[PDB]
């Protein structure tokens, strides 16, 4: 379901190896290496992203889920590339926005999402009205939460 070009893979390996100690930069060693989030978050292609902390956690397959291997780094790039299908992009956006990882976007997830975006912070009343507007347009079943199909549907209607 995901795609990579040869150029993307080759350029990604060069960028990933720059994050490694000199002794782990060979092809064989770099493919076994785990880069801590601190080094990943410093990458110019990710440093400005308001969701960078969540992006790292969603793509990590490491034992303590605190680092990225080259394989995780490529998984990340295949989703963020221009080749990724709208269905892949909305599937992973849902995982990134699900701050508690339970399968639905609730009011706290939406408030955390807004706070990531704004960093001038909204008043309690402005946040309440914005969450109410998001839920009115996205929560079809009116259960108070946004599931994956509701989310993919509202994203497919994007202005």
């Amino acid at each position: 379901l995901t795609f990579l070009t040869k150029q993307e893979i080759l350029l990604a390996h060069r960028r990933f190896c720059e994050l490694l100690p000199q002794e782990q930069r060979s092809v064989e060693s770099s493919l076994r290496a785990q880069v801590p989030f601190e080094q990943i978050l410093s990458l110019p292609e990710l440093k400005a992203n308001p969701f960078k902390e969540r992006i790292c956690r969603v793509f990590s397959t490491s034992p303590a889920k605190d680092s990225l291997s080259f394989e995780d780094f490529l998984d990340l790039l295949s989703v963020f590339s221009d080749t990724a299908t709208p269905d892949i992009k909305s599937h992973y956006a849902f995982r990134i926005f699900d701050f508690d990882d339970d399968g639905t976007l609730n009011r706290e997830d939406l408030s955390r999402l807004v706070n990531c975006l704004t960093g001038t912070r909204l008043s309690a009343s402005e946040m309440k009205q914005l969450i109410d507007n998001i839920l009115e347009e996205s929560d079809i079943d009116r259960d108070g939460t946004i599931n994956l199909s509701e989310f993919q549907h509202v994203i497919s209607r994007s202005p």
Binding site: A93, I96, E137
Partner: peptide, 15 residues
């Protein structure tokens, strides 16, 4: 404005 919000949220993530 739900739809406008999601456009800005997706653009902040993928743009």
């Amino acid at each position: 404005d739900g739809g406008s919000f999601w456009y800005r949220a997706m653009k902040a993530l993928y743009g």
